[PDB]
Curated annotation (Swiss-Prot), chain A:
<dbReference type="GO" id="GO:0070062">
    <property type="term" value="C:extracellular exosome"/>
</dbReference>
<dbReference type="GO" id="GO:0071222">
    <property type="term" value="P:cellular response to lipopolysaccharide"/>
</dbReference>
<dbReference type="GO" id="GO:0034097">
    <property type="term" value="P:response to cytokine"/>
</dbReference>
<dbReference type="GO" id="GO:0005654">
    <property type="term" value="C:nucleoplasm"/>
</dbReference>
<dbReference type="GO" id="GO:0032733">
    <property type="term" value="P:positive regulation of interleukin-10 production"/>
</dbReference>
<keyword id="KW-1133">Transmembrane helix</keyword>
<comment type="function">
    <text>Plays a critical role in induction and maintenance of immune tolerance to self. As a ligand for the inhibitory receptor PDCD1/PD-1, modulates the activation threshold of T-cells and limits T-cell effector response. Through a yet unknown activating receptor, may costimulate T-cell subsets that predominantly produce interleukin-10 (IL10). Can also act as a transcription coactivator: in response to hypoxia, translocates into the nucleus via its interaction with phosphorylated STAT3 and promotes transcription of GSDMC, leading to pyroptosis.</text>
</comment>
<protein>
    <recommendedName>
        <fullName>Programmed cell death 1 ligand 1</fullName>
    </recommendedName>
</protein>
<dbReference type="GO" id="GO:0042102">
    <property type="term" value="P:positive regulation of T cell proliferation"/>
</dbReference>
From Swiss-Prot, chain B:
<feature type="region of interest" description="Interaction with CD274/PDCD1L1">
    <location>
        <begin position="43"/>
        <end position="49"/>
    </location>
</feature>
<protein>
    <recommendedName>
        <fullName>Programmed cell death protein 1</fullName>
    </recommendedName>
</protein>
<feature type="glycosylation site" description="N-linked (GlcNAc...) asparagine">
    <location>
        <position position="30"/>
    </location>
</feature>
<feature type="region of interest" description="Nivolumab binding">
    <location>
        <begin position="1"/>
        <end position="6"/>
    </location>
</feature>
<feature type="glycosylation site" description="N-linked (GlcNAc...) asparagine">
    <location>
        <position position="46"/>
    </location>
</feature>
<feature type="domain" description="Ig-like V-type">
    <location>
        <begin position="7"/>
        <end position="115"/>
    </location>
</feature>
<feature type="topological domain" description="Extracellular">
    <location>
        <begin position="1"/>
        <end position="116"/>
    </location>
</feature>
<comment type="function">
    <text>The PDCD1-mediated inhibitory pathway is exploited by tumors to attenuate anti-tumor immunity and escape destruction by the immune system, thereby facilitating tumor survival. The interaction with CD274/PDCD1L1 inhibits cytotoxic T lymphocytes (CTLs) effector function. The blockage of the PDCD1-mediated pathway results in the reversal of the exhausted T-cell phenotype and the normalization of the anti-tumor response, providing a rationale for cancer immunotherapy.</text>
</comment>
<feature type="disulfide bond">
    <location>
        <begin position="26"/>
        <end position="93"/>
    </location>
</feature>
């Protein structure tokens, strides 16, 4: 019967970038907008509702107000392309497209959002010039929680104080700042490494204590 | 605005022998004047295969897969004529409401086992 097909069942998008996911549907002649219906949703939230050749924005979710849109140009070629700007963690999940055009079908697209600790801000402060004690600070945002490893150019393991808090700018993002107090000489190099946790669910086994054998 | 429940895809495990026919049942309560019911095969690697739908257009389907409506209008039979050993796997049915509002609900996965003769 009428079948909607999807080129990529999975998209991996960088946090803060723009993504465009596509759903294909059969077109053998001129696109008849009056009989065409296009529906985009994610976690029971309406994203795009295209009916009678026009986009119905009344039912659209607040989260996608002025950042989501359907590419009209691609529709004539039989391509339902959803473009979302400024992708956040909340945009990570399972999307669903529905197409009605002389028949009806729907497909599923998994979207993954990666928020790395790749925007690292640093600061260097002299605490005491007499003892040449310095204070080094690294900060970055991402998900999930990250620990900071301080190493010298000798790659010796150093211990600093790390503070992890929620990001004020965007929800569900962790702001990670670490501070190291150390006496050092000029032009020596230090490294702050942000080790992140698995962005996938952890695995757990349940253990139940049995009766004591004879 | 009357809420309705997701479709049921019974049996959860259908076991038939190759050469015979297998039939699923997709049931739900329709409050829609215009609606479609589709049949998907969900295999690993993320590929979703559309087998049949109601109403039937002709659209070119495998013909071994067809979806037919029972007289009561609430139960639908997803049939496979002469099931192959390669027909094993997980299958789902979904419903598309267009008339009252645009909403989509999908049934649970149902495993189909095709045993040798
Ligand atoms: Cl047929």
């Amino acid at each position: 019967a009428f079948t909607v097909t999807v080129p990529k069942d999975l998209y991996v998008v960088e946090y803060g970038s723009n993504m465009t996911i596509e759903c294909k549907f059969p077109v053998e002649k001129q696109l008849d907008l009056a009989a065409l219906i296009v529906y985009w949703e994610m976690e029971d939230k309406n994203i795009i509702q295209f009916v009678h050749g026009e986009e119905d924005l009344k039912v659209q979710h607040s989260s996608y107000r002025q950042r989501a849109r359907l590419l009209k140009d691609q529709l004539s070629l039989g391509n339902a392309a959803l473009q979302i700007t400024d992708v956040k963690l909340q945009d990570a999940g399972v999307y669903r497209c529905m197409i009605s055009y002389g028949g009806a079908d729907y497909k599923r697209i998994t979207v993954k959002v990666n928020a790395p600790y790749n925007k690292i801000n640093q600061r260097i402060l002299v605490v005491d010039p007499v003892t040449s004690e310095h204070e080094l600070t690294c900060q970055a945002e991402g998900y999930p929680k990250a620990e900071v490893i301080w190493t010298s150019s000798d790659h010796q393991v150093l211990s600093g104080k790390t503070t992890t808090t929620n990001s004020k700018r965007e929800e569900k993002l962790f702001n990670v700042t670490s501070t190291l107090r150390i006496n050092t000489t000029t032009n020596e190099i230090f490294y702050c490494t942000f080790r992140r946790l698995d962005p996938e669910e952890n695995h757990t086994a349940e253990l139940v204590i049995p009766e004591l054998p004879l | 605005d009357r809420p309705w429940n997701p479709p049921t895809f019974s049996p959860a495990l259908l076991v038939v022998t190759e050469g015979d026919n297998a039939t699923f049942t997709c049931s739900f309560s329709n409050t829609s004047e215009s609606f479609h019911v589709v049949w998907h095969r969900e295999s690993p690697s993320g590929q979703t295969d559309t087998l049949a739908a109601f109403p039937e257009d002709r659209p070119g389907q495998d013909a071994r897969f067809r979806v037919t409506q029972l007289p009561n209008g609430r139960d639908f039979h997803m049939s496979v004529v002469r099931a192959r050993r390669n027909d094993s796997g997980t299958y789902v049915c979904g419903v598309i409401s267009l008339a009252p509002k645009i909403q989509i609900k999908e049934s649970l996965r149902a495993e189909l086992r095709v045993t040798e003769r």
